[PDB]
PDB file of C-alpha atoms in Angstrom:
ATOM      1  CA  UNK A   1     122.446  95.340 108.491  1.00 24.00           C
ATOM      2  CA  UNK A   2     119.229  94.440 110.385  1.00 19.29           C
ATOM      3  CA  UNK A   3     117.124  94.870 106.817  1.00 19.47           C
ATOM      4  CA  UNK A   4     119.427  92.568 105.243  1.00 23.40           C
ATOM      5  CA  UNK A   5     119.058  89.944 108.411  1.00 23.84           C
ATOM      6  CA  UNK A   6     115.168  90.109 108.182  1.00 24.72           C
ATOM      7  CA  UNK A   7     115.148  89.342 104.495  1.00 23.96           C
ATOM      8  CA  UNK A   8     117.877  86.493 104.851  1.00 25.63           C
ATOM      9  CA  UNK A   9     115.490  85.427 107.296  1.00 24.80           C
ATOM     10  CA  UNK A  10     112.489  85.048 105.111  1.00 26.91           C
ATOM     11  CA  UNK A  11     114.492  83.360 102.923  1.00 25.97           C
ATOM     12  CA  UNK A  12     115.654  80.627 104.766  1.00 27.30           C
ATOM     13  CA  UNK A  13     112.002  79.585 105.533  1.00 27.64           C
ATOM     14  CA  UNK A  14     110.862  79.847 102.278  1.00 26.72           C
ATOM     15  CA  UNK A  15     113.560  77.777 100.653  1.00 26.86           C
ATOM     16  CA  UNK A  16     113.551  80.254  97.978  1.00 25.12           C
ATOM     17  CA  UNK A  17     116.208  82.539  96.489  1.00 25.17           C
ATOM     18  CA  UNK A  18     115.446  85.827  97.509  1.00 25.99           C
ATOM     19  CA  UNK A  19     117.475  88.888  95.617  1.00 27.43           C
ATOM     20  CA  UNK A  20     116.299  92.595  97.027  1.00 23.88           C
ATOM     21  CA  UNK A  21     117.605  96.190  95.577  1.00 23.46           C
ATOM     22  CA  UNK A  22     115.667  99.078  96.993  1.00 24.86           C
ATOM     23  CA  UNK A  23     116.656 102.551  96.632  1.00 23.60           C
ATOM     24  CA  UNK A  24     114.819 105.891  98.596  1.00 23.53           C
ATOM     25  CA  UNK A  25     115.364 108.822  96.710  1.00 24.99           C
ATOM     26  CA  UNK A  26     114.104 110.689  99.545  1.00 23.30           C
ATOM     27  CA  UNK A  27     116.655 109.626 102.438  1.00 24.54           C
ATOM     28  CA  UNK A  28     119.475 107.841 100.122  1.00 23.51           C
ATOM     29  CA  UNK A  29     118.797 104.517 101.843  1.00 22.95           C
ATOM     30  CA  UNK A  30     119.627 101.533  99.883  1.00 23.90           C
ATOM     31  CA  UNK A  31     119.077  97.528 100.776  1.00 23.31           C
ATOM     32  CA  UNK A  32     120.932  95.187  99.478  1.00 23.15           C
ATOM     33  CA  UNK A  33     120.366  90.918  99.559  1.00 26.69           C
ATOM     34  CA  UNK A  34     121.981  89.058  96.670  1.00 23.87           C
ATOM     35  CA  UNK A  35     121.553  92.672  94.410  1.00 24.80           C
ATOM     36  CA  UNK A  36     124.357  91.130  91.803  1.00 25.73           C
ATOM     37  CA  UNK A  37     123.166  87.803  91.431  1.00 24.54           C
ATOM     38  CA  UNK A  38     120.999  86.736  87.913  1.00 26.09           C
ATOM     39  CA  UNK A  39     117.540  85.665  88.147  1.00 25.57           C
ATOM     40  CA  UNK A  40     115.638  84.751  85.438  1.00 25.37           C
ATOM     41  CA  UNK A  41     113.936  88.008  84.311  1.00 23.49           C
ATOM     42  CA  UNK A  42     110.626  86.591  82.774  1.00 21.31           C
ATOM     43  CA  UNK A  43     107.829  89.507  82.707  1.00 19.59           C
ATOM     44  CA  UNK A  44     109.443  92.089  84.175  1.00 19.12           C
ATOM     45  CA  UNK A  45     110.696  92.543  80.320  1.00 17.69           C
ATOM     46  CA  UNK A  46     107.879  94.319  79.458  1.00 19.11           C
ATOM     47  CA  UNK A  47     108.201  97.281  80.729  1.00 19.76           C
ATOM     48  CA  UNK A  48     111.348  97.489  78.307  1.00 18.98           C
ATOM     49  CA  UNK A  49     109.921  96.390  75.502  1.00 14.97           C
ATOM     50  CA  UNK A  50     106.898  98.719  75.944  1.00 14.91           C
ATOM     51  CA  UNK A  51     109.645 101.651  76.717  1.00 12.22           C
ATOM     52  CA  UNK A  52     111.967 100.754  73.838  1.00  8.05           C
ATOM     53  CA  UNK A  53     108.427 101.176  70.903  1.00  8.02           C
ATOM     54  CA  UNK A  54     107.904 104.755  72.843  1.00  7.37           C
ATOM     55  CA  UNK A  55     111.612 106.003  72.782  1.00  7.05           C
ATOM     56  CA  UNK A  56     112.861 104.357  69.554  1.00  4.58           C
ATOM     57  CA  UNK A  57     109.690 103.498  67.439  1.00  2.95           C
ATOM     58  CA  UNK A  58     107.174 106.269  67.817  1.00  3.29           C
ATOM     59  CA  UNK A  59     108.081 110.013  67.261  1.00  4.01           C
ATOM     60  CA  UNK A  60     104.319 112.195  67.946  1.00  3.13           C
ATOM     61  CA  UNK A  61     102.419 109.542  68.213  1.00  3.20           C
ATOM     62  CA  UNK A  62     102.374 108.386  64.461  1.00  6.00           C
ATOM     63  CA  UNK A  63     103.252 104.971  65.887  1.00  5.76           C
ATOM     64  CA  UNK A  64     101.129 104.893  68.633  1.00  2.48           C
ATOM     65  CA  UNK A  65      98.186 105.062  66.375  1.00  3.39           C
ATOM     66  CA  UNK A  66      98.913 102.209  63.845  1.00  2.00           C
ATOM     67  CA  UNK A  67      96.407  99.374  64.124  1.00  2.00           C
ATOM     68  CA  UNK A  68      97.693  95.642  64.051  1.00  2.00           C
ATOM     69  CA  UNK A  69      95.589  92.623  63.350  1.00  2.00           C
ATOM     70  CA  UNK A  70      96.641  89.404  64.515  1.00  2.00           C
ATOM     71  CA  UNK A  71      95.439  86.125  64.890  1.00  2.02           C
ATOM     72  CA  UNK A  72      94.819  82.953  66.852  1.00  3.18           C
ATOM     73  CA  UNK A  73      97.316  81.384  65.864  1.00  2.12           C
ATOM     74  CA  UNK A  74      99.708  84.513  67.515  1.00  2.00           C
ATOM     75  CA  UNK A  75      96.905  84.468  70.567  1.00  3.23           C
ATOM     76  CA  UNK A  76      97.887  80.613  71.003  1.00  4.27           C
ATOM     77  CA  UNK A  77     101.517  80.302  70.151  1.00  4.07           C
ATOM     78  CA  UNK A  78     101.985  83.144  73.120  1.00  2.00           C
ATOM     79  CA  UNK A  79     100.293  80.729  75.886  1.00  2.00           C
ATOM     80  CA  UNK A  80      98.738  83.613  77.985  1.00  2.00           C
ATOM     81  CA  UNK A  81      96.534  86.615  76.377  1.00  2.00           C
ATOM     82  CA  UNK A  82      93.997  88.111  78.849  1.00  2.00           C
ATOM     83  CA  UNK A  83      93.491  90.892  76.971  1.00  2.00           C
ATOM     84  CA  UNK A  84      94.583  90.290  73.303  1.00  2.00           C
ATOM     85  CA  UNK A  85      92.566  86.922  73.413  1.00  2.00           C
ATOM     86  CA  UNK A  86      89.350  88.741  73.834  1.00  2.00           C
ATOM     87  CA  UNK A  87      86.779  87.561  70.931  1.00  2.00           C
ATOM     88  CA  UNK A  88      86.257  91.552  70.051  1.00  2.00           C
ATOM     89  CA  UNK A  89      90.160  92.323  70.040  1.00  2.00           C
ATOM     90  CA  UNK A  90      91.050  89.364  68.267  1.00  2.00           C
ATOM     91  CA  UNK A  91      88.437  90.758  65.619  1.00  2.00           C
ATOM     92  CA  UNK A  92      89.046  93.888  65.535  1.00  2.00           C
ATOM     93  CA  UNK A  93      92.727  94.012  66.391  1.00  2.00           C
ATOM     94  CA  UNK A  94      94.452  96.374  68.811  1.00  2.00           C
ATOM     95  CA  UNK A  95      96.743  99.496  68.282  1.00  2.00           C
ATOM     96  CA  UNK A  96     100.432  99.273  69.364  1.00  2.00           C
ATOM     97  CA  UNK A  97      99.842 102.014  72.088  1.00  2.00           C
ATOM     98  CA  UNK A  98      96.633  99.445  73.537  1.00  2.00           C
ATOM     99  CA  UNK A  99      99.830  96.445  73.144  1.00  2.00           C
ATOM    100  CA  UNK A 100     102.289  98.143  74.769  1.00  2.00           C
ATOM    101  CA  UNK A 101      99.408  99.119  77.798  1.00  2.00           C
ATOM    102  CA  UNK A 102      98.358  95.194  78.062  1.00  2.00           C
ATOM    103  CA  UNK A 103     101.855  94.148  77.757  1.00  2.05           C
ATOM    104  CA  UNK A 104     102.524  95.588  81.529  1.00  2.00           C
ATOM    105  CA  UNK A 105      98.543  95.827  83.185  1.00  2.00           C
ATOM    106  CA  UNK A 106      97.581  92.665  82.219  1.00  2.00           C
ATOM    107  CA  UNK A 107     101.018  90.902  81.802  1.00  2.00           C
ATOM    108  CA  UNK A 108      99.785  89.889  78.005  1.00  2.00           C
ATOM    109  CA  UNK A 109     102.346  87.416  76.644  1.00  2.00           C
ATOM    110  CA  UNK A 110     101.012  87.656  72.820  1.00  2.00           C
ATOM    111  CA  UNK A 111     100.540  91.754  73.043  1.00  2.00           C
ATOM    112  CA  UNK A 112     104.700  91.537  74.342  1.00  2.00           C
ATOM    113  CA  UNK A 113     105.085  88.727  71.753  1.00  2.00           C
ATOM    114  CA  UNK A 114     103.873  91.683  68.568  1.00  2.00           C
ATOM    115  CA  UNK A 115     105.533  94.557  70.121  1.00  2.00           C
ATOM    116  CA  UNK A 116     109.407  92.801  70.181  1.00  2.00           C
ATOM    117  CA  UNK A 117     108.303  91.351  66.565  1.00  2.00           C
ATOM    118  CA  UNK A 118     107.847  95.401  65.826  1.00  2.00           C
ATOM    119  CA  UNK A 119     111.048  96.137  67.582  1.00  2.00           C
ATOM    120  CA  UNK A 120     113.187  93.566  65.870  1.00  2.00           C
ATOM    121  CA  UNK A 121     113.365  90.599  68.540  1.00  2.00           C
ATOM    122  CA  UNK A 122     114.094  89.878  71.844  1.00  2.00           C
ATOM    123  CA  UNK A 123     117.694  91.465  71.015  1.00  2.00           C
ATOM    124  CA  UNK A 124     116.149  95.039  70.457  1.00  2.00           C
ATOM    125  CA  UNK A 125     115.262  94.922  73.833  1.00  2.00           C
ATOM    126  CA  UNK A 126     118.959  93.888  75.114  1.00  2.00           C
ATOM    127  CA  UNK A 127     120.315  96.849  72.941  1.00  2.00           C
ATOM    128  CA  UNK A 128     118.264  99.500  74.956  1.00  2.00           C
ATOM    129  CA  UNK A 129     119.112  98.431  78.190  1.00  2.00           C
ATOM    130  CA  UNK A 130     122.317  98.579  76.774  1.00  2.00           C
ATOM    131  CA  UNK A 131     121.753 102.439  75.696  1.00  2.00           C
ATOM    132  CA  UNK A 132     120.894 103.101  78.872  1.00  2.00           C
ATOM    133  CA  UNK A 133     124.262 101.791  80.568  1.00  2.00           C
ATOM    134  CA  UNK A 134     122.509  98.798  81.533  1.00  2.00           C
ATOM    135  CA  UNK A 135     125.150  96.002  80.825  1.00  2.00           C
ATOM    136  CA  UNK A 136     123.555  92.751  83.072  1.00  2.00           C
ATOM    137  CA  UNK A 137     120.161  92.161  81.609  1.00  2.00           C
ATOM    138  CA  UNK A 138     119.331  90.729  78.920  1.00  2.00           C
ATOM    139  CA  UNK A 139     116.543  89.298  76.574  1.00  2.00           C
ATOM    140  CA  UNK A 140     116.953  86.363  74.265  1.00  2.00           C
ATOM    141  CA  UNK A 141     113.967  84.698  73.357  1.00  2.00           C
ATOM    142  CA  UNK A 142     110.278  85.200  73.002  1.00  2.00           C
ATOM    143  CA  UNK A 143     107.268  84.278  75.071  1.00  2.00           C
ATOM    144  CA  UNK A 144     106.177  81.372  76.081  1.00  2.00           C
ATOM    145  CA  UNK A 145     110.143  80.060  76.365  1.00  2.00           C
ATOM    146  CA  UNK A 146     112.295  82.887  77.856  1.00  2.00           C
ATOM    147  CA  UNK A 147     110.426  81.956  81.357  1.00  2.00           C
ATOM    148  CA  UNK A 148     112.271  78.706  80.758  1.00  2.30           C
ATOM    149  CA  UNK A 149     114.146  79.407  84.213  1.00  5.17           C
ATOM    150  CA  UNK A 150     116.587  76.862  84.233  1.00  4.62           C
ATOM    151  CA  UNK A 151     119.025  77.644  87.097  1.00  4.64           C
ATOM    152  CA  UNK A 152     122.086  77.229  85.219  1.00  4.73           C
ATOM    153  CA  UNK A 153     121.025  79.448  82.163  1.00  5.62           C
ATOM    154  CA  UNK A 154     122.335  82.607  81.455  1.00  5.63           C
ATOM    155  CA  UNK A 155     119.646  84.135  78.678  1.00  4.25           C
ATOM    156  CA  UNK A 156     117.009  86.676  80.107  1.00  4.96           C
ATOM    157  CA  UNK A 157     118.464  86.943  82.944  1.00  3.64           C
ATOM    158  CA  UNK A 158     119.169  90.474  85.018  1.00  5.99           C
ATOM    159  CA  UNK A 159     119.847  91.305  88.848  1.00  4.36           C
ATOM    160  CA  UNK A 160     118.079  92.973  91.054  1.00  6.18           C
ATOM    161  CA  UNK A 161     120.653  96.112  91.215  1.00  6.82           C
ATOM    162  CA  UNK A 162     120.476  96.036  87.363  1.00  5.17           C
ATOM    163  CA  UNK A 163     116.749  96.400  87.088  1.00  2.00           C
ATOM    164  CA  UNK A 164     116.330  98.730  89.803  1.00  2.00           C
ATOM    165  CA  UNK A 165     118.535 101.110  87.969  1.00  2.00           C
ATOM    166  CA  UNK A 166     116.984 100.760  84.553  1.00  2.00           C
ATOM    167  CA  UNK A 167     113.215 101.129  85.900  1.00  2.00           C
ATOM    168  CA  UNK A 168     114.794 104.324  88.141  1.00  2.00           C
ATOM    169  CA  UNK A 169     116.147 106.015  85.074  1.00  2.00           C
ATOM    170  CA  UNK A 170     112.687 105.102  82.732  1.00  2.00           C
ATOM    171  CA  UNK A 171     110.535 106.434  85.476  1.00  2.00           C
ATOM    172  CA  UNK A 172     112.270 108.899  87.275  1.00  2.00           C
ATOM    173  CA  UNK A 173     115.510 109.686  85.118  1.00  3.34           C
ATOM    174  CA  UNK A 174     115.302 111.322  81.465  1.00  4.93           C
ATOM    175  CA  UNK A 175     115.450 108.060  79.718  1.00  4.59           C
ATOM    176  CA  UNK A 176     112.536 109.132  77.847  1.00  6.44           C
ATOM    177  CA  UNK A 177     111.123 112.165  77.077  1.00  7.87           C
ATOM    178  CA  UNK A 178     108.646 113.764  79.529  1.00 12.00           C
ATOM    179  CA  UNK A 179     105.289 113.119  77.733  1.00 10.90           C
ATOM    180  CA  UNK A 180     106.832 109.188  77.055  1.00 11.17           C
ATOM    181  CA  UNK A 181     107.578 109.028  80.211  1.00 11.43           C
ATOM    182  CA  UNK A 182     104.424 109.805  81.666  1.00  9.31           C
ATOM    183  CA  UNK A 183     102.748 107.321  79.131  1.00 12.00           C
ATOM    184  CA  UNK A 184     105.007 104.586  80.492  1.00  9.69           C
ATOM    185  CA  UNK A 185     104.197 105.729  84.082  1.00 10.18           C
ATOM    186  CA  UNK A 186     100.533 105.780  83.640  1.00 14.12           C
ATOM    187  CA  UNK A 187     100.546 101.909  82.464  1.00 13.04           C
ATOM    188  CA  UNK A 188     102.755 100.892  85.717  1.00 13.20           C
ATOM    189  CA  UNK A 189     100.113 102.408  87.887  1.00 12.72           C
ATOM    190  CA  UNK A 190      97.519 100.648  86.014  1.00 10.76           C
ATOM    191  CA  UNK A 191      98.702  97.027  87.055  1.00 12.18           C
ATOM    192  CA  UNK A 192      96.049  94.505  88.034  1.00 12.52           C
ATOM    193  CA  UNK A 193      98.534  91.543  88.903  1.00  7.85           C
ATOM    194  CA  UNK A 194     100.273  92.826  91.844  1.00  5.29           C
ATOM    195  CA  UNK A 195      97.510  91.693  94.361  1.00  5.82           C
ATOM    196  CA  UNK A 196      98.950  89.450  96.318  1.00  4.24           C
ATOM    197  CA  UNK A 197     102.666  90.654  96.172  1.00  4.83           C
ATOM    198  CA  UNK A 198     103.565  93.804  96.403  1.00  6.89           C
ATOM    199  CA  UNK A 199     100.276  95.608  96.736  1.00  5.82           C
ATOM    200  CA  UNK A 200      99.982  93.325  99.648  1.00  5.71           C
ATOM    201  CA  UNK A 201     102.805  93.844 101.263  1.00  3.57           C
ATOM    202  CA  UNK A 202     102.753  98.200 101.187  1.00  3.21           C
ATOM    203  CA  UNK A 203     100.808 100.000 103.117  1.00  2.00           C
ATOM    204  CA  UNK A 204      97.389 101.260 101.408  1.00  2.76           C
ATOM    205  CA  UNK A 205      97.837 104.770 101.155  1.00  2.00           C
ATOM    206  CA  UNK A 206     101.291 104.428  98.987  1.00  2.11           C
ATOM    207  CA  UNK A 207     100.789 104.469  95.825  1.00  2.00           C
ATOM    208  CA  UNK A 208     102.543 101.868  93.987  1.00  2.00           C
ATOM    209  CA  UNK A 209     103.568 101.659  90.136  1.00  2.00           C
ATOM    210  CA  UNK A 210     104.917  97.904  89.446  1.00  4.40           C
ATOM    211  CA  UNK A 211     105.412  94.929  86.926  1.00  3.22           C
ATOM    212  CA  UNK A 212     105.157  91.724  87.905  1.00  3.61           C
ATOM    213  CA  UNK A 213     106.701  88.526  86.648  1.00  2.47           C
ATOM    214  CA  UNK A 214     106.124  84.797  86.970  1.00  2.60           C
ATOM    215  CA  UNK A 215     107.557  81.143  85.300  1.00  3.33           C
ATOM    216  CA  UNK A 216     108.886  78.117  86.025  1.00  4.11           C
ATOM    217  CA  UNK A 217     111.302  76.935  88.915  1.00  2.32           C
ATOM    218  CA  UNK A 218     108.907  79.059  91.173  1.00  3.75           C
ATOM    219  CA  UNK A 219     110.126  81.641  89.637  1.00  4.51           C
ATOM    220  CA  UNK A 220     107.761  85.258  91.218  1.00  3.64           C
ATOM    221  CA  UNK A 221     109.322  89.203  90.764  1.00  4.12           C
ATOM    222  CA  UNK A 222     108.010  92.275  91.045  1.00  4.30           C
ATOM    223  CA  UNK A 223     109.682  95.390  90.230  1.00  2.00           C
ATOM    224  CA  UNK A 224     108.268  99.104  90.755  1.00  2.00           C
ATOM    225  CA  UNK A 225     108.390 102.708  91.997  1.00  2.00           C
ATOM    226  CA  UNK A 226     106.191 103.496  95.054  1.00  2.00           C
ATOM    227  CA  UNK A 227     105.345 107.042  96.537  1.00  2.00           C
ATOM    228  CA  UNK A 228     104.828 106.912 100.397  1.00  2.00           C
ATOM    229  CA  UNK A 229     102.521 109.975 101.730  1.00  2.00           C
ATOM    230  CA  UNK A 230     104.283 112.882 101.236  1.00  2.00           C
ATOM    231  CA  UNK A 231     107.352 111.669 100.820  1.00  2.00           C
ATOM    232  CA  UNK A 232     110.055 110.983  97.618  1.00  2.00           C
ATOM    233  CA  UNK A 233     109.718 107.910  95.290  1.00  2.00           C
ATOM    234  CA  UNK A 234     110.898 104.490  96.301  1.00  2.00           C
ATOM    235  CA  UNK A 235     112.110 102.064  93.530  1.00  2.00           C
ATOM    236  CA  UNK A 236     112.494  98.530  94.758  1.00  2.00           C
ATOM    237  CA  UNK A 237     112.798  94.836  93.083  1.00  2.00           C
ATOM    238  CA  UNK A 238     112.335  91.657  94.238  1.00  2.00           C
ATOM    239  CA  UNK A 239     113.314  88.545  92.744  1.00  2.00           C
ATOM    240  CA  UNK A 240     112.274  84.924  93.900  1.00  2.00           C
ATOM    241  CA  UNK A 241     113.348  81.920  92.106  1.00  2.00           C
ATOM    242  CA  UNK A 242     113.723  78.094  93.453  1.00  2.78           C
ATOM    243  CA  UNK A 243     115.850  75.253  91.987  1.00  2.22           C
ATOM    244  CA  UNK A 244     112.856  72.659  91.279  1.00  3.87           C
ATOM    245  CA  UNK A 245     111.123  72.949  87.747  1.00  5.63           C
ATOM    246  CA  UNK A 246     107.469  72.254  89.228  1.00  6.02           C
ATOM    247  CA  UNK A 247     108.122  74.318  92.381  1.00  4.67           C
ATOM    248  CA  UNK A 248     104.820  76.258  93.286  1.00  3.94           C
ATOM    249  CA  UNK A 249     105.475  80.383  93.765  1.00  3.46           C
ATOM    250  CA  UNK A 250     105.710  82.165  97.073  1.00  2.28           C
ATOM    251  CA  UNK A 251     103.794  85.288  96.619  1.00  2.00           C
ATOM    252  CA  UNK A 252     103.914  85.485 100.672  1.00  3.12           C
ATOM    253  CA  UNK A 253     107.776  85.555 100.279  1.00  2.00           C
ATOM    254  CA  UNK A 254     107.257  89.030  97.746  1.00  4.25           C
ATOM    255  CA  UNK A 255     104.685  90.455  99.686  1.00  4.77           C
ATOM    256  CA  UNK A 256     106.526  90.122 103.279  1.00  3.58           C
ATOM    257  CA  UNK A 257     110.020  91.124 101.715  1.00  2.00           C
ATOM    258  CA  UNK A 258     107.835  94.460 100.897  1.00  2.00           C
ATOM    259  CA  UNK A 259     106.907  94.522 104.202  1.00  2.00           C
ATOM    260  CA  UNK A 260     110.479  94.845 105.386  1.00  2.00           C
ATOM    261  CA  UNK A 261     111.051  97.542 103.200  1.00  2.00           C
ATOM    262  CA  UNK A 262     108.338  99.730 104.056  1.00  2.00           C
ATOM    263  CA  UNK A 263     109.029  99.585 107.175  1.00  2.00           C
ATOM    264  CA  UNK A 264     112.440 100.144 106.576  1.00  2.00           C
ATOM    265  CA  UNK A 265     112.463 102.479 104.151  1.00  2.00           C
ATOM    266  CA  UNK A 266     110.098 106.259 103.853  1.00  2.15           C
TER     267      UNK A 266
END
């Protein structure tokens, strides 16, 4: 009740479409604002993908291990490679366990871009979700155009309730198996781009695992699992998007919607 009235609050300043699911495993405590409504998605995908080469691709490793080479033409056609852009990686290439890592830390469009060519396409990601009971979101194309954002499309799309339930069950559930698991867990709490959203917004001392994701229409999410001290894991999402195409971000909006829920929540 009173969460829900501070976050409709910060969203009628911002001018921004604010969508909150958080869920404390400790206490049971859920918060709810606009948790059924589609956003566009846009690099919060990547967790999946990355998720969907350790459950369905790799079996001890084997796949893990292979080296891919790509090229500038794959570093340029991606329009965003911090990591895979590199002079010595695009030399020497980078092995699918470095692509999946980049693909979340770094938010590397081309390293995503090579891991959903390994798994098929954009629709190998939809079909996990899909195994996991997840029936809302949804990937359709490839980077740079699935952060497209158009308010009235449909493709790549998910809801905040959705993708609250799907990191849960990766991270915390048995999704994957316990040594994939902590793989996938490891690269979470390895993110760099969180700085100004939800790493701002939580208190210091909790640590926080998250993926963050950014396009056009304003579009600015950021979806995790945070530990408060001593206490039981907290998964939360946030979703921000805006109806104009050039519309800057609000990473103030995703960093003081955390806010709310920490002090709400554990």
């Amino acid at each position: 009740s009173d969460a829900e009235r501070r976050l409709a609050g910060l969203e009628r300043a911002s001018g921004a479409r604010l969508g909150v699911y958080a869920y404390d495993t400790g206490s049971g405590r859920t918060v709810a604002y606009r948790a059924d409504e589609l956003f566009p998605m846009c690099s919060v995908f990547k967790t999946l993908s990355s998720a969907a080469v350790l459950r369905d691709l790799d079996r001890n490793g084997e796949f893990l291990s292979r080296r891919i080479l790509y090229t500038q033409d794959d570093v340029e056609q991606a329009d965003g490679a911090p990591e895979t852009g590199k002079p010595q990686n695009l030399a020497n290439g980078m092995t699918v366990e470095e692509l999946c890592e980049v693909s979340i830390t770094a938010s590397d469009n081309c390293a995503a871009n090579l891991m959903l060519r390994e798994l098929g396409g954009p629709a190998a990601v939809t079909r996990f979700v899909r195994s996991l009971g997840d029936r809302v979101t949804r990937l359709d194309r490839w980077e740079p155009e699935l952060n497209s954002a158009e308010p009235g499309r449909v493709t790549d799309t998910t809801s905040p309730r959705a993708i609250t339930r799907t990191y849960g069950r990766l991270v915390l559930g048995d999704a994957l198996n316990p040594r994939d698991r902590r793989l996938l867990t490891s690269w979470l709490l390895a993110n760099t781009t969180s700085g100004d959203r939800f790493r701002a917004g939580l208190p210091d001392d909790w640590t926080l695992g998250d993926k963050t994701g950014a396009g056009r229409y304003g579009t600015n999410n950021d979806a995790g699992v945070t530990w408060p001290p001593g206490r039981a894991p907290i998964v939360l999402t946030v979703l921000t998007a805006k109806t104009e195409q050039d519309a800057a971000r609000d990473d103030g909006l995703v960093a003081d919607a955390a806010r709310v829920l920490a002090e709400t929540l554990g």
